[PDB]
Amino acid sequence: MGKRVDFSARTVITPDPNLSIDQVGVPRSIAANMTFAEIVTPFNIDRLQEL
């Protein structure tokens, strides 16, 4: 029912009035370790290649 999962994170929170209600400030370390499996297409073949 409840189990551990990959592609997750956890840390302390901080206020930031300069962000919208639907926005969340993600550090660069957590964002660097976490990834999103994006499929390659001729529309993003260029961008994904440079990355």
């Binding site: 930031d16 639907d22 550090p27 964002a31």
Partner: peptide, 20 residues
């Protein structure tokens, strides 16, 4: 709730204050 990502240097999850 679902949130949109905003990348910045420091190491804390910064939230809007109304969504707290």
């Amino acid at each position: 709730m679902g949130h949109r990502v905003r990348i910045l240097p420091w190491s804390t999850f910064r939230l809007n204050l109304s969504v707290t």
